[PDB]
Amino acid sequence: SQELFSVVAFHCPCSPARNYLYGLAAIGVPALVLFIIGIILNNHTWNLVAECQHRRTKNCSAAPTFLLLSSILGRAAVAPVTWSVISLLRGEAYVCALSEFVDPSSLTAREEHFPSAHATEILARFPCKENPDNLSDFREEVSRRLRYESQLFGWLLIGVVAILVFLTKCLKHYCSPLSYRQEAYWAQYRANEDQLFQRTAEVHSRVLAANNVRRFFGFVALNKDDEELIANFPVEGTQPRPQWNAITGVYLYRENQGLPLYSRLHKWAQGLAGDNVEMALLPSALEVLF
Amino acid sequence: ELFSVVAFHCPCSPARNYLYGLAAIGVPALVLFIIGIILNNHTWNLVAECQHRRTKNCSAAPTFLLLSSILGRAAVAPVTWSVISLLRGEAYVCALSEFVDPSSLTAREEHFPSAHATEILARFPCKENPDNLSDFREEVSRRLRYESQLFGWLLIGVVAILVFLTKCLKHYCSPLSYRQEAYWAQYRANEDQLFQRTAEVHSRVLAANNVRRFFGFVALNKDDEELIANFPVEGTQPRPQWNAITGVYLYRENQGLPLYSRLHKWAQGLAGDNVEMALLPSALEVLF
């Protein structure tokens, strides 16, 4: 999109004490947005909230919670880092932000021709070329010193991240009580469960919705494949709210009778997860009589 | 095309350009805000709820969440327009050009005339400036365009936090787990698609019978004949039956089994003398 790319184009405001506020905003806001998107799309942060919903009593201690935020923030921080790296490697965001802090006395590649009356003002205007031609050499001397530091931090940030990933994945396997092969089978189960469950939820809702539409008009218009779903997958009712509440939340490898349990849905299906009426449509049957 | 007609053109006149900027930006933000309301079906069943009660029976709490969802799902279009119009910078340099103080101007010696300060400043966006003042034309333009883009990124940041805080509060304060609401959402989409699609088929089958009663036959295509054969209609649904599935609904649970829509509430049988707008008077009055 040629028009929409020019919208997010970096336009350095060549003014002192002003070009780093823009540099912080033009880089820190997209990094913040990518951080928020990573949190929102991650399902592991909503069952953490759902854990805090029904427990309501700080039941989870620091040990399980800190190992959940580390997973949420570790997976979320991938996008801001890969944006904070590209911006540093480009060099535009750093030369604009730091052009006013270059020491005029430390300049080189020429004799001391640099003015001292308005030094911060002229320096801040280097990224926009708006410089006198007698300082053209000084402009490129600064334009390379600051771009070097921008890429020096860009490669150190890549190097530091590539070590934290190595240390994290090394400590995750060392400290986990499970073997790395079972955690690979566990990860394959959680992928297959979270895919089949969504697939059946769509079908079990369409079949349930078809029954309600049939109850209104007397017939339902269904496609060639939708008609097969009604006969192949008949529904009889809706799952109770406490049954839904028994499969949503965090889970850390509880094992039963020497046999592993790999999810809350798995733990519920074994029967190990299963008076006062809440949020009912109408009052008690005794009150209905009056 | 349209972009040529709706292209932004800054009127370089003091105390006059920002009015144009308000109209060239605030009106498309209003129109996109109106369109979001109209297209959102959740704003019409809210009206239907007020239509039948006629006594303000519902409290503020059911309405406050209902009204919030309508605005939130519709305020996206103005924001993605207000942000773009702010990151472009054209609509803000034009509006705030005349408010720039010549006293604080730099990047040039103090040659700024004082006879007409506001008049000259307001003419910067149109490049109708003397060449002796051209150093300030780029100086003023960069200062204002920076604030235009600075506000754009803060608007994105604030919006990207309100979305996060809204979704976090929606899940925490909801009485249902995030998976049941996911299933509930997958039900409403499936019901609406099925309900509208049968309503089209039901009308066509009903219309065919009316046509057959008139001409003695109906001219159907190959697929329409299947619709008549497969789906025979026996009558029409009463108005109170229709009125039992229109309005707002907030997860009423029956006998421990959830209900996911008013149609589902009606299908279970939990929703269903004085005659209004009748074609003909009372049967006794028809005789007289």
Epitope: N276, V277, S284, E287, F290 | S59, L65
Partner: nanobody, 125 residues
Framework: QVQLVESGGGSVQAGGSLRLSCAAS????????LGWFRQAPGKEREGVAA????????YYADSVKGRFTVSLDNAKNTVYLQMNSLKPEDTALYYC???????????????????WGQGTQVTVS
């Protein structure tokens, strides 16, 4: 917390006299609902009668007014009834229930407490 004890089931012909005792044990201090329900195979459950402790008025079904009467032992905190003119329509499972006059917050909906007790009563003829 509240357990209901019921007895008095039997098999009597038409016109027989039967009495069903619903014994309530637990926290009945917040109970405002006392009555009986019947259900038979092949159909749903209906309520023959119900009593309010707090308001004091009482309900009877259409086939129960003048045919069955329900009494409350306030001192004993139990429910008693009388069965008169037994009919084949009375062959159903009888239960006694209770409730706590559930409030209503418009955001969530009605919420209350309900209890049940399993009993049987069939008339041979």
């Amino acid at each position: 917390q509240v357990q209901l004890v019921e007895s008095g089931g039997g098999s009597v012909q038409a016109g027989g006299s039967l009495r069903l005792s619903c014994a309530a044990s637990g926290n009945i201090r917040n109970i405002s609902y006392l009555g009986w329900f019947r259900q038979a195979p092949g159909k749903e459950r209906e309520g023959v009668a119900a009593l309010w402790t707090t308001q004091g008025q009482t309900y009877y079904a259409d086939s129960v007014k003048g045919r069955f009467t329900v009494s409350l032992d306030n001192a004993k905190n139990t429910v008693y009834l009388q069965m008169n003119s037994l009919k084949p329509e009375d062959t159903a499972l009888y239960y006694c229930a209770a409730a706590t006059s559930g409030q209503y917050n418009p955001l969530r909906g009605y919420h209350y407490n309900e209890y049940w007790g399993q009993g049987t009563q069939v008339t041979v003829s």
